[model samples]
Target: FARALYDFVPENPEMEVALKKGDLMAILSKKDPLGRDSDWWKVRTKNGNIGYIPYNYIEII
Candidate 1:
């Protein structure tokens, strides 16, 4: 689990989801499906929105 640092609007809305400040999310992986970009994490939000989010944008719980 983790908390969002700020509201994030996905550049690729079709693939990623938006996050509100302090929103909770389940950290699924350190990297995306392609196994690249370790800075991006695969997460599932409280609303069940699953996508990649920048690691720096969240605080690990």
Candidate 2:
């Protein structure tokens, strides 16, 4: 539901999604469903990859 503002490599690939600048992603939830971190967002990539990403790394377009 938004675009990545900068390149991001997942620190924990098993639980996070990688992002490239200008890439499109769908925001699954503003709050983590499992209550992981408040600042992270659960999202899905254009390719359907799902994981957590830092909220600061993206912006609505």
Task: Give me the candidate number with maximum TM-score.
Answer: 1
TM-score of each: 0.77, 0.75
- Residues 1-61, candidate 2: write the lDDT tens digits: 7778788667684777778888877777876566665666877887667787788887776
Worst 10 residues of 2 by lDDT: 31-40
True-structure lDDT of candidate 1:
0.78
lDDT of each: 0.78, 0.75
User: RMSD in angstroms, all models?
Assistant: 2.2, 2.8
**Candidate 2 clash pair list:** 1-25, 1-26
* Candidate 1 local lDDT, 1-61, one digit each (tens): 8788888767585877678997777777886567776568877887668887888888898
Per-residue lDDT, model 2, residue 48, is 64
